[PDB]
Ligand SMILES: COc1ccc(Cl)cc1C(=O)NCCc1ccc(S(=O)(=O)NC(=O)NC2CCCCC2)cc1
């Protein structure tokens with residue numbers, strides 16, 4: 001209940017080793033290149049803002 | 062034309078009260094190297110700031126018309142004061158200061174700033190975090206980083222204030238003079254250098270003087286040296 005309500009001790013927490021020495025900023029965590037058609041032979045894009053044409057009772061059948 | 066700034070102020074002073082920049086007129090040539098130098102104690106830094114627009118102008122007249130000029134200085138003038146300011150980021154990020162990366166511009170500025178051994182001796186090179194909350198350096202190094210950041214920009218106008226005063230040595234001052242000549246002169250960037258050492262005034266396109274107020278025009282050195290102030294010539298040549 002109310003773990004750290006008292007909030008005085010901060011603004012002087014010294015820089016970590018990876019901070020000052022600049023070992024953390026070596027991210028090297030780039031996202032993979034976006035494919036157009038997957039290796040499994042399935043196209044994977046994301047169409048958006050398509051006007052929804054509702055549904056039809058024929059779809060249940 | 063050549064004049065990049067224009068002022069005729071009766072007073073542009075700090076705070077409120079008695080003026081400190083009273084009764085001045087000035088003009089900065091385009092592509093100049095105006096060496097605003099005077100006795101240490103009055104005028105220089107406050108003049109540069111009030112020109113930037115950070116003082117309580119009491120009797121100034123609005124005039125800012127560069128080459129094709131205008132809305133509040135209309136442009137970005139690089140700057141570096143008598144005290145450096147650094148981001149808490151990598152040296153490369155610090156120097157770039159939010160601009161397109163350019164190995165040509167960056168490499169030329171690194172060579173022209175002579176900071177290479179410092180960068181090499183740091184544990185990670187230009188990828189090392191600098192500034193407060195990081196590896197702490199010496200005053201000359203910080204001066205060099207600041208002036209290098211102010212060098213690599215896209216600003217036709219430029220400003221400085223005692224960039225050699227805290228340099229490592231007068232030999233480093235000669236090196237910085239050489240770099241400024243090699244890089245700044247290759248372009249047509251308006252530079253207004255200020256330094257208490259009068260020896261370096263090569264290609265002085267203008268000379269503004271300050272002693273509790275402006276002395277005379279930013280004219281060439283030849284007309285200056287015998288413009289009814291011979292004590293100026295004696296003092297500058299003697300030292
Ligand atoms: C648990 O309190 C009460 C217990 C009894 C009674 Cl009769 C009243 C209260 C009460 O009036 N409570 C205030 C509302 C309240 C409750 C719980 C918590 S919390 O979840 O324990 N703490 C956090 O969420 N901190 C996060 C993380 C950092 C800051 C942002 C929020 C936080 C806020």
Ligand SMILES: Nc1ncnc2c1ncn2[C@@H]1O[C@H](COP(=O)(O)OP(=O)(O)OP(=O)(O)O)[C@@H](O)[C@H]1O
Pocket residue numbers: 075081100101102103104105106107108143223
């Ligand atoms: N930011 C400021 N705020 C208030 N007063 C200042 C400020 N900067 C300078 N002053 C004061 O105003 C006067 C004019 O300062 P000026 O800018 O001429 O200094 P300076 O000639 O650049 O000196 P130095 O080159 O040694 O720093 C000085 O006496 C100084 O004490």
